[PDB]
Design a protein around this ligand. Sequence first.
Ligand SMILES: CC[C@H](C)[C@H](N)C(=O)O
Ligand SMILES: CC[C@H](C)[C@H](N)C(=O)O
Ligand SMILES: [Fe+2]
Ligand SMILES: [Fe+2]
Lengths: 258, 258
Amino acid sequence: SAAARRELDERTDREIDRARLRRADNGFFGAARNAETVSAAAGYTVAVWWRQMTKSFMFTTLAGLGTLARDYASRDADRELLGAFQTVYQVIGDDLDNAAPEFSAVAPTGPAGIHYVWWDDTIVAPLAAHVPEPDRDAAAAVPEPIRALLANMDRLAADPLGAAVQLRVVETIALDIAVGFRRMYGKVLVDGERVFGSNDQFAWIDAHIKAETVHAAQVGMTGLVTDEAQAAEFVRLVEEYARHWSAALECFADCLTG
Amino acid sequence: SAAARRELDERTDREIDRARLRRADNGFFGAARNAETVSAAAGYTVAVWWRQMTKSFMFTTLAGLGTLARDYASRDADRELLGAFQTVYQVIGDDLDNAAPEFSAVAPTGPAGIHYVWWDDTIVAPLAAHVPEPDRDAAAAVPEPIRALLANMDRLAADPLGAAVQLRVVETIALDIAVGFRRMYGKVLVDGERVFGSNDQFAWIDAHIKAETVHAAQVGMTGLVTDEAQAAEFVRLVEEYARHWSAALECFADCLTG
Ligand SMILES: CC[C@H](C)[C@H](N)C(=O)O
Ligand SMILES: CC[C@H](C)[C@H](N)C(=O)O
Ligand SMILES: [Fe+2]
Ligand SMILES: [Fe+2]
């Protein structure tokens, strides 16, 4: 339980390395290179996929926290478990209640600020006007990779380590995705005009960029892990979850290169 | 779904009326009358029971929030559900992370401030020194009424309406319990001396008094309820939960009058 914590963290980054999730390796982040004016339709398709992915992420992570809590009503928890418990609760509050100042400063109030709602409202909606009603059945269909990620989430919703796994993996990729979104949606043209013209139209993306970059410079999630039996399962779950995340982001990449 | 909300709330207070939970009706709050120097042992017994009751309350309510969340990953939720979702998350943050200013101002930092921890540390511990190691097996035994409340909590942990039920019932009785605790522990004598001498030794109790009184003057939980099928079940669950809460508080009362 001593260097064990250090090895778990280093192994987890190894799993994320291997899953091809790093800035350099995942095809989606190369969307920067795809100056090819992202089609409004391509932007809509990814935006609608992302809406469900982030909605599921938030709800199944809160569900995963509830699952842990179920167990600790009875079992006595060390001060270290309780602190990681608190951390998970705090971190989840960003997506559900804009708890962090980088978000509350700018996000809409109340349920309008739930990040899958805020995203649906300022990204999915503008692009819908520029996409035909028949064309919107291309997103109504979620590719197997994206459906596999959502089902991994559903499983982790019921797993005593699911919150820890989802937050640990997503926090490492969150900035690259948010920068990928600012690049790709900055290249959506309607007869040569940016659908997303002004800076304020990017509020969601830039609050995440800000929140995430300052985070990665001021440094645990694995604090929930106690037995080496748990650490083994954590890595196993991380392997599965990171892999699904990468192939889902690959669908974003293929979408940009039809 | 219109006056339906109003009737649900009024019926819920009727159920709490009937369960004999109001200040006037539940035997525990009459502890004020029990000037009979509360025995340290009596204080210890109730404190240890309360520790588990509040620990279970917090964890099974968070668990109940996770259960709701499980469902809403997939199902589309109206802006009203989402707002009640946010409210439950906020309210739970008091007990888990001293979210409200009345608490963060005064509570210990980090896991030390989780209210069942903070209570164990400043109420259970002082009284333990004044209670013999053999005598502490009177609390190690939880009376059926208190065990029945804990099991109701465990069931509600897995119920899509459990959080709503627990928070709705507990918020109506929270001030009376906290005042009952300030009265009863102000009357614990060790050879004629207050075990709890100074005002600072009452920090936990008084933060709750403050947080709860200001709350009851600045006015929903049932926002989670949609169908009349849910409202019916809500009242049913409230009937069961309030009844268990009252008999558990009756065990506190009997304990003070051995
Ligand atoms: C998957 C979650 C990402 C990183 C971000 N928190 C959001 O609101 O979508
Ligand atoms: C049952 C919960 C009570 C009212 C209080 N919130 C506590 O910390 O114990
Ligand atoms: Fe977010
Ligand atoms: Fe509390």
